[PDB]
Design a protein around this ligand. Structure first.
Ligand SMILES: [Mg+2]
Ligand SMILES: [Mg+2]
Ligand SMILES: [Mg+2]
Ligand SMILES: [Mg+2]
Ligand SMILES: [Mg+2]
Ligand SMILES: [Mg+2]
Ligand SMILES: [Mg+2]
Ligand SMILES: [Mg+2]
Ligand SMILES: [Mg+2]
Ligand SMILES: [Mg+2]
Ligand SMILES: [Mg+2]
Ligand SMILES: [Mg+2]
Ligand SMILES: [Mg+2]
Ligand SMILES: [Mg+2]
Ligand SMILES: [Mg+2]
Ligand SMILES: [Mg+2]
Ligand SMILES: [Mg+2]
Ligand SMILES: [Mg+2]
Ligand SMILES: [Mg+2]
Ligand SMILES: [Mg+2]
Ligand SMILES: [Mg+2]
Ligand SMILES: [Mg+2]
Ligand SMILES: [Mg+2]
Ligand SMILES: [Mg+2]
Ligand SMILES: [Mg+2]
Ligand SMILES: [Mg+2]
Ligand SMILES: [Mg+2]
Ligand SMILES: [Mg+2]
Ligand SMILES: [Mg+2]
Ligand SMILES: [Mg+2]
Ligand SMILES: [Mg+2]
Ligand SMILES: [Mg+2]
Ligand SMILES: [Mg+2]
Ligand SMILES: [Mg+2]
Ligand SMILES: [Mg+2]
Lengths: 187, 147, 105, 52, 124, 52
RNA sequence: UGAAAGCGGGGCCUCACGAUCCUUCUGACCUUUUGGGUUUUAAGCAGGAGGUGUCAGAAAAGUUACCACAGGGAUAACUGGC
RNA sequence: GAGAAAGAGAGUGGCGCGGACGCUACGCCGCGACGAGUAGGAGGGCCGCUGCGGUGAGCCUUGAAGCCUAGGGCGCGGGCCC
RNA sequence: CCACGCGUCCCCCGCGAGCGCACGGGGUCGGCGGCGAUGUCGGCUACCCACCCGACCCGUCUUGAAACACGGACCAAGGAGUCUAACACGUGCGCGAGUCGGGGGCUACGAAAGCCGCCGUGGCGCAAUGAAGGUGAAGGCCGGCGGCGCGCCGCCGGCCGAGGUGGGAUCCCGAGGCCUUCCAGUCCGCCGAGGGCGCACCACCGGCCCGUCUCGCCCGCCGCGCCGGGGAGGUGGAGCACGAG
RNA sequence: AAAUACCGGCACGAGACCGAUAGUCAACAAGUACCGUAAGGGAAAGUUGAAAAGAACUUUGAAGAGAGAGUUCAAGAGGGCGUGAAACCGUUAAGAGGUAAACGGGUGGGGUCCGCGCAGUCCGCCCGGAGGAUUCAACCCGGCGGCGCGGUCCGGCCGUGCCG
């Protein structure tokens, strides 16, 4: 026979989006062609991010966009998020941005267009720059979700800063034996 | 839908997904989360530290209304009042400052989290934190109290 | 028999609860019952207000709520005797009265 | 357009409603694909089948 | 547009028919009668169709015009062709080619016209 | 798209009357049959009487 | 302590020992004691102690030949087997 | 498709009207390596039962559902069409 | 001998045409022969029978079952991971620092559907920490007034103003050149030596809020008090560190 | 009083429910027959046909039961009667038989039917040979359609554009 071990024989990654959306599948039908038929890997990574799940393409906010676009060198470039460009209310002035996203929330659309910016979709991005040149590809904070505070080294183990699953935060709800130094032990 | 579930693909499998050595018996580890001190000790100490025992004072008749004091930040202090006041207090060369009455917006205590733009205010709250007061003074503008 | 990681919880089902479960399938029948009763009452008191009497300006009691003003129970006797409306005539012409209210302000 | 609003006019007899924004606009895919913006910036097609 | 309509009518249409591990569409302007993007005849701005005539001699060739897309009464134009077998195919070939009128399926149109003509000549 | 056509109002006799109203923007809101299926599935369940 | 370098926060090293709850004692010009104040009392917070030797920690005598039930050939009393 | 980072690049001076198939892009096509399996886990079913919303100008007294069959068949198989 | 001509400076001694055979990117014949209307031709499969080789009866508990282990005479119909609640994670969908009307109200199928917005009361989220009183999430530079054996500065006016190191998909600049007769030379792309700005995330160092311990000097006034605030250095926290619900 | 609760009762309407081993225990002379001293336990059980037109009469037998005859479209629906499966059984026909029967792989023989097999496919183009048409191209007239190649023809409409 052959003594190859078939555990990791199959790659796990996606080849099609799980969504049954039709506009997203048209964007996939376009970027399949562009990444197959160009030699710029912006197209490969942007179809790889069109495929993803909405917990893997987190919402990038407009404060991150303003900061990471005002970092020096990248003036009049095109910000590209594959997720959802959301408003961030704790920022006052907004510079002229040139952004491209699947879906921009309504107050962020109003904010950028009052600042004098321009919103694009991905079909217009492919017309405007097919190899994706002149673009800054950004992604949202992926471990910004509240779930990742429950992950890692478990609570009740030394040097583990993990939020434990408790039904209501209070005085009585798991503050006593693993936590105190008088009540039992402190981990 | 039961059409999509697991038991439509576990027909013909003689144990229905629960093993043949250890059968699916009714309640092997006690009911619920029993056995905290005794035989689920290391689940309750590797995954819920703190669970057994008392700590803290007993308060017999708690009233969330008495303990009610919700907070706003200096980041979102300008969110409360519309954009027209900001742009008018920016255009306004007379030094006149808008009143930000946080209490009618529904927040009793102003805490100071982030950067406040250099633009004068009269922040009208029910409580203040020291850093929030110092940031409003450092912008140049006053913190008045209402009860 | 708890598994790896997850909230330990106390569901209150240890009683026999299936003999007593109030199910809401008469929600829309009860709403159309109430609004047919409300239409009948509103057309049987024909020029009078359908909402009943008038109810006073009242500030909510506690620290969470005293900045909000809501509609109270009835007009107190002291503001009635200041407004010159008689105690027993106020509710007969449509002004709700409860005598239990003070006026500290 | 009084019910569900225009793209720039809000919904006149709902309270807070506007039409949902598109995810891509130029939906005719062939008029994107055989367009001189893209067809310029592509490699040459390799369509010679090379059997075993 | 057209691909937007195709991603809708692609599986949940009423002209589609599925059995015996084959697939089709009984829609009124489908050369080769199969469910595909190219050969479907309701979702395009320009579309040929080949139908047999109402009388038992000839082929009505259907063109979808360019102007009235949303006006289905004045959207299609019938042309009746009652000729010899070669010049019927010559008319359909010139009609699709020299107009540059959707040249993807000139060959499918002349295949379908030839099949209708042999069905319309008498049977031994 | 972005441009809006002009639909004529037909008389009761059948032929076109002179009046023509612009297309409302609702008719070029996006088409998504997945969430039409989703909303129709979850809302066709509400008219259902119990059985036991 | 030694003059000093240093050495020493128990026994030259390898064993000599104990969670929650509860009680007791110690500590601070400490917190709460519920509408306000004062004062006893009680609750807390931290640090020891009272102890579970089945030693990760129930509070526990027998008998059944009048016997029962769920099971076990995971386990005896036969034969057969090495 | 071809051993060699990259243009069958654009500019300035010295008769016969003809050309197969394709592309349900979730589609079609080419290369290689590979296939054990109880507990279990997962994916696909144009496998199957019953009912509901759509739809087939569906079928049906010129004989539906069911049942029988040494008849013709398809699918690896669930099954199905005659 | 996989050696071919002419021209010239120096050294040592870039398009020739045609035909054809083919050990050449997977089989063709541009080769044939028979038998066929009432007894023959084909149909693997499915009916019965014959022969060779193989061939123990299933389920199940088991370290092991054909077991001298238990259940099973045969057949038809019924017959076992369902529903409610809670939680967790993954996934699709709408809106997005917000979100949700589920409870209420207004207008055959319809007990549906729509609408409310001064019905967002409220839930969850946007802020943690502490047992509790409570507190409650950048700093610096410039000028004026050892203060002395607060170059630090206590406070005022202006200015910069919201971390850093390493790795990082993407992009950005481009020493050179990518040929059709040769020299310059333009515009369009394309490739790349090197060098940049660096998303998510990871590791580390900094910093900020609450508790707690230690060491310390300052400041505020309506009550100058067993008052209030402030600093430095470690440490406990399910925190912040430009949302993610 | 009101808002509120209702698996009993009178009278109703409806069902992504069940379809006679299901749904109530009960679709029927069901809390009936039946068991128990008693408290109490408690079934099974729907279907001729359109209409009874429910088989007059002859005939053997004592009769049940047959054969003819008749009604019906149908008795292949004959008073427990639609459809009528399986286990099981009778009979007919075919095949077979000393390792219990059975089974898997491989063929062989015999059946049963199917092919409507039993002188064998067609299809373009060319060449020839006999035929038959109101007949091809080009023109002319009318309609319809497709498209800076009108560099910039005239007129409208729209913008999820802009300036006044
Ligand atoms: Mg192998
Ligand atoms: Mg394997
Ligand atoms: Mg694997
Ligand atoms: Mg298995
Ligand atoms: Mg078992
Ligand atoms: Mg187990
Ligand atoms: Mg075991
Ligand atoms: Mg269980
Ligand atoms: Mg124990
Ligand atoms: Mg388990
Ligand atoms: Mg020391
Ligand atoms: Mg008291
Ligand atoms: Mg005895
Ligand atoms: Mg022995
Ligand atoms: Mg396998
Ligand atoms: Mg043998
Ligand atoms: Mg067993
Ligand atoms: Mg066992
Ligand atoms: Mg054993
Ligand atoms: Mg085992
Ligand atoms: Mg044995
Ligand atoms: Mg047993
Ligand atoms: Mg037995
Ligand atoms: Mg069954
Ligand atoms: Mg999720
Ligand atoms: Mg109804
Ligand atoms: Mg029955
Ligand atoms: Mg019954
Ligand atoms: Mg039955
Ligand atoms: Mg019957
Ligand atoms: Mg029956
Ligand atoms: Mg019949
Ligand atoms: Mg019958
Ligand atoms: Mg019968
Ligand atoms: Mg015989």
């Amino acid at each position: 026979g052959v003594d190859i071990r078939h555990n990791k024989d199959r790659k796990v990654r996606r080849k099609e989006p799980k969504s049954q959306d039709i506009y997203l599948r048209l964007l996939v039908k376009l970027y399949r062609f562009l990444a197959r038929r160009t030699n710029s890997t912006f197209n490969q990574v942007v179809l790889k991010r069109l495929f993803m799940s909405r917990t893997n393409r987190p919402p990038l906010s407009l404060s991150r966009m303003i900061r990471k676009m005002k970092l020096p060198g990248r003036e009049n470039k095109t910000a590209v998020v594959v997720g959802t460009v959301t408003d961030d209310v704790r920022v006052q002035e907004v510079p002229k941005l040139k952004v491209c996203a699947l879906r921009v929330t309504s107050r962020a659309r109003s904010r950028i267009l009052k600042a004098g910016g321009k919103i694009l979709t991905f079909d217009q991005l492919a017309l405007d720059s097919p190899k994706g040149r002149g673009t800054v590809l950004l992604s949202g904070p992926r471990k910004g979700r509240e779930v990742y505070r429950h992950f890692g080294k478990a609570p009740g183990t030394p040097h583990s800063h993990t939020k434990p699953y408790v039904r209501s935060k209070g005085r009585k709800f798991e503050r006593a034996r693993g936590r105190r130094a008088s009540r039992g032990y402190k981990n | 839908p039961s059409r999509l579930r697991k038991t439509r693909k576990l027909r013909g499998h003689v144990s229905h997904g629960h093993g043949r050595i250890g059968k699916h018996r009714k309640h092997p580890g006690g009911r619920g989360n029993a056995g905290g001190m005794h035989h689920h000790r290391i689940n309750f100490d590797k995954y819920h530290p703190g669970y057994f025992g008392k700590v803290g004072m007993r308060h017999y008749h708690l009233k969330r209304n008495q303990s009610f004091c919700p907070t706003v930040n200096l980041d979102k202090l300008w969110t409360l009042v519309s954009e027209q006041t900001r742009v008018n207090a920016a255009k306004n060369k007379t030094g006149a400052a808008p009143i930000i009455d946080v209490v009618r917006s529904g927040y009793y205590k102003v805490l100071g989290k982030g950067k406040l733009p250099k633009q004068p205010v009269i922040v009208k709250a029910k409580f203040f934190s020291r850093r929030a007061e110092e940031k409003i003074k450092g912008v140049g503008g006053a913190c008045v109290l209402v009860a | 028999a708890p598994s790896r990681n997850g909230m330990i919880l106390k569901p209150h089902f240890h009683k026999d609860w299936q003999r007593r479960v109030a199910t809401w399938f008469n929600q829309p029948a009860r709403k159309i019952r109430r609004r047919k009763a409300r239409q009948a009452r509103a057309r049987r008191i024909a020029p009078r207000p359908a909402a009943g009497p008038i109810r006073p300006i009242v500030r909510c009691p506690t620290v969470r709520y005293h900045t909000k003003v809501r509609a109270g129970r009835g007009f107190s006797l002291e503001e009635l005797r200041v407004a010159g409306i008689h105690k027993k005539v106020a509710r007969t012409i449509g002004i709700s009265v409860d005598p239990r209210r003070r006026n500290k302000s | 357009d009084d019910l569900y609003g225009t793209w720039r006019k809000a919904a006149s007899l709902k309270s807070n409603y506007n039409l949902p924004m598109h995810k891509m606009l130029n939906t005719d895919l062939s008029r994107i694909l055989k367009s001189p913006e893209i067809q310029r910036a592509l490699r040459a097609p390799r369509k010679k089948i090379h059997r075993r | 547009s057209a691909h937007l309509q195709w991603m809708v009518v692609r599986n949940c249409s009423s002209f589609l028919i599925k059995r015996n591990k084959q697939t089709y569409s009984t829609e009124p302007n489908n050369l080769k009668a199969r469910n595909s993007f190219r050969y479907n005849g309701l979702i395009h701005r320009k579309t040929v169709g080949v139908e047999p005539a109402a009388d038992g001699k000839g082929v009505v060739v259907v063109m979808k015009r360019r102007s009235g897309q949303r006006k289905p009464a004045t959207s299609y134009v019938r042309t009746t062709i009652n000729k010899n077998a070669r010049a019927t195919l010559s008319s359909i070939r010139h009609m699709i080619r020299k107009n540059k009128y959707h040249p993807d399926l000139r060959m499918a149109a002349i295949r379908r016209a030839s099949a209708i003509l042999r069905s319309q000549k008498p049977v031994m | 798209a972005c441009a809006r056509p002009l639909i004529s109002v037909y008389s009761e006799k059948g032929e076109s009357s002179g009046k023509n109203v612009t297309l409302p923007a609702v008719f070029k809101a996006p088409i998504r049959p997945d969430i039409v299926n989703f909303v129709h599935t979850n809302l066709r369940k509400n008219n259902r009487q119990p059985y036991a």
